[PDB]
Amino acid sequence: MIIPALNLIDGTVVRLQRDYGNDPLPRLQDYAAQGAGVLHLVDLTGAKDPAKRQIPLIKTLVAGVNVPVQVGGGVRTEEDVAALLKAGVARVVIGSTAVKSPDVVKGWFERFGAQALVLALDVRIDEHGTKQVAVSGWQENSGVSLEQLVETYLPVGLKHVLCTDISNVSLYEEVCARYPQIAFQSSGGIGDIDDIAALRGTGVRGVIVGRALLEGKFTVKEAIQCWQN
Ligand SMILES: NC(=O)c1ncn([C@@H]2O[C@H](COP(=O)(O)O)[C@@H](O)[C@H]2O)c1/N=C/N[C@@H]1O[C@H](COP(=O)(O)O)[C@@H](O)[C@H]1O
């Protein structure tokens, strides 16, 4: 599947900061109209300040489309997860907290179930060739590999992993083969339609596409047609 994505700040569509308007819902609806089966939202406001998580906007956006939406952005507590699910999102995306407090997040897998959670890992390949997990592009490696972290969560049913390279096709070929029971999502690196063709057959289950759609390089419809071949 293709997974079209938007980043939101105070109701505004942005790309990291370029502004793309205050009307996210017509965009999402047209992404769905073209055949998308899943949408992806990052709440940058909420990531910066969990008091200001855009629950009301997200409720509206989810109600306005007919496909599952996965939503992340500084999810830190059990309460955050439950509030997003209650507002109707299909899956909550968890990056930083999943690296920081794995035993606590394993509890969340037990409470909400693996179908409701996506583990998001920022990865950079270090000089030693190791796929290191980092909590963001602005901070050093955490001293845990992709493999270690994935294997920490497998005993509680881990199913969905979102993997971004922030240091390439080879990466995804390798991790998808090693964990065939996990559905990996690629994120970043899509500059034109050929980057999508390049991911076909790697074993990646979902391709997240953000900026390229906003900049008009191709449509969701063309991306799906290339993806499905
Ligand atoms: N400041 C940020 O940019 C940021 N902060 C957190 N995230 C993501 O949110 C998720 C949860 O992170 P936490 O806040 O829980 O730590 C993770 O996936 C992070 O990568 C962030 N990601 C933002 N944009 C994403 O980066 C990729 C760019 O794609 P492109 O347009 O096609 O080129 C896509 O996945 C976009 O949705």
- Ligand 1 pocket member 206 (CB < 6 A): no
For ligand 1, the distance from its centroid to the CA atom of residue 42, given in whole angstroms, is: 6
Q: Angle at CA 181, nearest 5°, toward 228 and 28?
A: 45
Q: Are 19 and 222 in contact (CB under 8 A)?
A: no
| Ligand 1 pocket: which of 81, 167, 187 to mutate (most atoms within 8 A of CB) | 187
- Ligand 1 pocket member 5 (CB < 6 A): yes
Atom of ligand 1 nearest to the CA of 94: 15
**What burial class does residue 89 get, using C-beta atoms within 10 Å of its C-beta: 0-12 exposed, 13-18 middle, 19+ buried?**
buried
CA dist., res. 76 & res. 54, Å (int): 15
| Inter-helix orientation angle 78-86/55-63, to 10° | 40
121 phi, psi to nearest 5 deg:
-120, 120
Q: Which helix (H) or strand (E) holds 133?
A: strand 131-134
- Where exactly are the structural domains of the chain? 1-229
The residue count for the chain = 229
- Ligand 1 pocket member 195 (CB < 6 A): no
Atom of ligand 1 nearest to the CA of 190: 32
Query: What 8-state DSSP symbol labels residue 145?
Result: B
The CATH number of domain 1-229, selected from 3.40.50.300, 3.40.1350.10, 3.20.20.70, 3.40.50.150 = 3.20.20.70
Identify which of 41, 30, 36 has the alpha carbon closest to the alpha carbon of residue 2: 36
Q: Are 149 and 102 in contact (CB under 8 A)?
A: yes
CA dist., res. 80 & res. 64, Å (int): 22
